[PDB]
Write a protein that holds these residues in place. Structure first.
Motif, PDB file in Angstrom:
ATOM      1  N   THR A  45       0.813  -1.206   0.000  1.00 27.41           N
ATOM      2  CA  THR A  45       0.000   0.000   0.000  1.00 27.41           C
ATOM      3  C   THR A  45       0.852   1.264   0.000  1.00 27.41           C
ATOM      4  OG1 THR A  45      -1.819  -1.086   1.181  1.00 27.41           O
ATOM      5  CG2 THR A  45      -1.720   1.326   1.277  1.00 27.41           C
ATOM      6  N   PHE A  46       0.424   2.253  -0.779  1.00 25.64           N
ATOM      7  CA  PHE A  46       1.108   3.537  -0.857  1.00 25.64           C
ATOM      8  C   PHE A  46       0.164   4.573  -0.258  1.00 25.64           C
ATOM      9  CE2 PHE A  46       3.303   1.258  -4.306  1.00 25.64           C
ATOM     10  CZ  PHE A  46       4.621   1.544  -3.980  1.00 25.64           C
ATOM     11  N   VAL A  47       0.713   5.475   0.549  1.00 24.53           N
ATOM     12  CA  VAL A  47      -0.080   6.521   1.189  1.00 24.53           C
ATOM     13  C   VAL A  47       0.266   7.866   0.552  1.00 24.53           C
ATOM     14  CG1 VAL A  47      -0.665   7.624   3.365  1.00 24.53           C
ATOM     15  CG2 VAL A  47      -0.074   5.191   3.306  1.00 24.53           C
ATOM     16  N   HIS A  48      -0.759   8.625   0.175  1.00 26.83           N
ATOM     17  CA  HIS A  48      -0.542   9.900  -0.500  1.00 26.83           C
ATOM     18  C   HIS A  48      -0.554  11.162   0.353  1.00 26.83           C
ATOM     19  CE1 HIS A  48      -0.707   7.352  -3.946  1.00 26.83           C
ATOM     20  NE2 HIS A  48      -1.976   7.047  -3.748  1.00 26.83           N
ATOM     21  N   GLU A  49      -0.695  10.995   1.659  1.00 29.70           N
ATOM     22  CA  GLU A  49      -0.697  12.135   2.562  1.00 29.70           C
ATOM     23  C   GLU A  49       0.752  12.558   2.801  1.00 29.70           C
ATOM     24  OE1 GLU A  49      -3.519  13.418   3.301  1.00 29.70           O
ATOM     25  OE2 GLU A  49      -4.792  11.741   2.682  1.00 29.70           O
ATOM     26  N   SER A  50       0.940  13.678   3.489  1.00 26.17           N
ATOM     27  CA  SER A  50       2.283  14.161   3.777  1.00 26.17           C
ATOM     28  C   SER A  50       2.991  13.238   4.760  1.00 26.17           C
ATOM     29  CB  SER A  50       2.222  15.567   4.367  1.00 26.17           C
ATOM     30  OG  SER A  50       1.493  15.562   5.583  1.00 26.17           O
ATOM     31  N   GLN A  74      -3.796   3.479  14.587  1.00 23.72           N
ATOM     32  CA  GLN A  74      -4.754   3.749  13.523  1.00 23.72           C
ATOM     33  C   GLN A  74      -4.981   5.251  13.411  1.00 23.72           C
ATOM     34  OE1 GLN A  74      -8.239   1.207  13.375  1.00 23.72           O
ATOM     35  NE2 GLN A  74      -9.535   2.999  12.989  1.00 23.72           N
ATOM     36  N   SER A  75      -4.999   5.759  12.182  1.00 19.25           N
ATOM     37  CA  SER A  75      -5.202   7.186  11.959  1.00 19.25           C
ATOM     38  C   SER A  75      -6.638   7.571  12.288  1.00 19.25           C
ATOM     39  CB  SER A  75      -4.876   7.553  10.500  1.00 19.25           C
ATOM     40  OG  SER A  75      -5.761   6.931   9.584  1.00 19.25           O
ATOM     41  N   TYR A  76      -6.806   8.706  12.960  1.00 21.01           N
ATOM     42  CA  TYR A  76      -8.140   9.174  13.315  1.00 21.01           C
ATOM     43  C   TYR A  76      -8.885   9.600  12.059  1.00 21.01           C
ATOM     44  CZ  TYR A  76      -6.733   9.167  18.227  1.00 21.01           C
ATOM     45  OH  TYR A  76      -6.311   8.782  19.479  1.00 21.01           O
ATOM     46  N   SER A  77      -8.164  10.238  11.144  1.00 20.67           N
ATOM     47  CA  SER A  77      -8.753  10.683   9.888  1.00 20.67           C
ATOM     48  C   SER A  77      -8.495   9.653   8.797  1.00 20.67           C
ATOM     49  CB  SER A  77      -8.140  12.018   9.460  1.00 20.67           C
ATOM     50  OG  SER A  77      -8.274  12.997  10.475  1.00 20.67           O
ATOM     51  N   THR A  78      -9.326   9.665   7.763  1.00 18.71           N
ATOM     52  CA  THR A  78      -9.125   8.751   6.653  1.00 18.71           C
ATOM     53  C   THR A  78      -8.002   9.369   5.830  1.00 18.71           C
ATOM     54  OG1 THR A  78     -10.711   9.895   5.210  1.00 18.71           O
ATOM     55  CG2 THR A  78     -11.558   8.118   6.596  1.00 18.71           C
ATOM     56  N   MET A  79      -7.295   8.532   5.079  1.00 22.99           N
ATOM     57  CA  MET A  79      -6.198   9.000   4.249  1.00 22.99           C
ATOM     58  C   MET A  79      -6.304   8.466   2.834  1.00 22.99           C
ATOM     59  SD  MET A  79      -2.855   8.805   6.696  1.00 22.99           S
ATOM     60  CE  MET A  79      -2.642   9.972   8.034  1.00 22.99           C
ATOM     61  N   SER A  80      -5.771   9.239   1.896  1.00 20.56           N
ATOM     62  CA  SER A  80      -5.755   8.861   0.492  1.00 20.56           C
ATOM     63  C   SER A  80      -4.669   7.803   0.333  1.00 20.56           C
ATOM     64  CB  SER A  80      -5.417  10.077  -0.367  1.00 20.56           C
ATOM     65  OG  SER A  80      -5.308   9.727  -1.737  1.00 20.56           O
ATOM     66  N   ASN A 103      -9.867   5.576   0.319  1.00 25.55           N
ATOM     67  CA  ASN A 103      -9.744   6.567   1.377  1.00 25.55           C
ATOM     68  C   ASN A 103     -10.146   5.843   2.645  1.00 25.55           C
ATOM     69  OD1 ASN A 103      -9.250   9.474   0.229  1.00 25.55           O
ATOM     70  ND2 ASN A 103     -10.687   8.495  -1.190  1.00 25.55           N
ATOM     71  N   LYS A 104      -9.149   5.457   3.429  1.00 26.15           N
ATOM     72  CA  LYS A 104      -9.404   4.717   4.653  1.00 26.15           C
ATOM     73  C   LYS A 104      -8.448   5.111   5.759  1.00 26.15           C
ATOM     74  CE  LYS A 104     -10.414   0.383   4.169  1.00 26.15           C
ATOM     75  NZ  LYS A 104     -10.326  -1.082   3.915  1.00 26.15           N
ATOM     76  N   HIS A 105      -8.715   4.600   6.955  1.00 31.17           N
ATOM     77  CA  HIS A 105      -7.851   4.858   8.094  1.00 31.17           C
ATOM     78  C   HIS A 105      -6.720   3.853   7.942  1.00 31.17           C
ATOM     79  CE1 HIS A 105     -11.124   7.102  10.054  1.00 31.17           C
ATOM     80  NE2 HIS A 105     -11.908   6.145   9.596  1.00 31.17           N
ATOM     81  N   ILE A 106      -5.486   4.304   8.094  1.00 32.93           N
ATOM     82  CA  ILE A 106      -4.366   3.384   7.978  1.00 32.93           C
ATOM     83  C   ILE A 106      -3.924   2.925   9.360  1.00 32.93           C
ATOM     84  CG2 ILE A 106      -3.578   4.560   5.897  1.00 32.93           C
ATOM     85  CD1 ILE A 106      -1.246   5.718   7.547  1.00 32.93           C
ATOM     86  N   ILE A 107      -3.294   1.758   9.415  1.00 33.36           N
ATOM     87  CA  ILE A 107      -2.770   1.233  10.669  1.00 33.36           C
ATOM     88  C   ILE A 107      -1.307   0.914  10.404  1.00 33.36           C
ATOM     89  CG2 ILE A 107      -2.844  -0.575  12.401  1.00 33.36           C
ATOM     90  CD1 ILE A 107      -5.769  -1.018  11.750  1.00 33.36           C
ATOM     91  N   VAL A 108      -0.419   1.551  11.159  1.00 35.43           N
ATOM     92  CA  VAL A 108       1.012   1.336  10.998  1.00 35.43           C
ATOM     93  C   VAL A 108       1.657   0.944  12.322  1.00 35.43           C
ATOM     94  CG1 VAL A 108       1.182   2.992   9.099  1.00 35.43           C
ATOM     95  CG2 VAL A 108       1.542   3.764  11.468  1.00 35.43           C
TER      96      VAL A 108
END
Ligand SMILES: Nc1ncnc2c1ncn2[C@@H]1O[C@H](COP(=O)(O)O)[C@@H](OP(=O)(O)O)[C@H]1O
Length: 124
Positions: A45-50, A74-80, A103-108
């Motif tokens: 998966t690639f994340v497009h946020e900063s 887990q991110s509170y906001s959804t991310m591209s 556009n979903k919440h990511i878990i890292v």
């Protein structure tokens, strides 16, 4: 060498594009980021946020990791994001992927000092 943090950026960060991943996105990116050198990485998966926004996830919602460890967030906001999945007819070294934007919440999973992302666990 390459730090775990650096590897995470290489394998999962693509801030440049907002969310216009073409049908050829994964085929190009999986190759350019060297995830098809020894074999075809099955899923990525690639994340497009900063980078700042993704690194901030390490201080967000603490959730259990798929492997049982407790260092996942887990991110509170959804991310591209863009999910890459090797096709059934894909054959190394000609790695082929299906590209899917979402556009979903990511878990890292995070480690070290600074406490930064070192593994992409899932998206929900
Ligand atoms: N909770 C966790 N904390 C740190 N690393 C983890 C982890 N869960 C899995 N990993 C590992 O971190 C590496 C990065 O994963 P990913 O490439 O999906 O971002 C993977 O190892 P390998 O690369 O040796 O298989 C994966 O197995």
């Amino acid at each position: 060498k390459e730090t775990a943090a650096a590897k995470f950026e290489r394998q999962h960060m693509d801030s440049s594009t907002s969310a216009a991943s073409s049908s050829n996105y994964c085929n190009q990116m999986m190759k350019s980021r060297n995830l098809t050198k020894d074999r075809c990485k099955p899923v990525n998966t690639f994340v497009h946020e900063s980078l700042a926004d993704v690194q901030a996830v390490c201080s967000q919602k603490n959730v259990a990791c798929k492997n049982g460890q407790t260092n996942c967030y887990q991110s509170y906001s959804t991310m591209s994001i863009t999910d890459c999945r090797e096709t059934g007819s894909s054959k190394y070294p000609n790695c082929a992927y299906k590209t899917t934007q979402a556009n979903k919440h990511i878990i890292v999973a995070c480690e070290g000092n600074p406490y930064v992302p070192v593994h992409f666990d899932a998206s929900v």
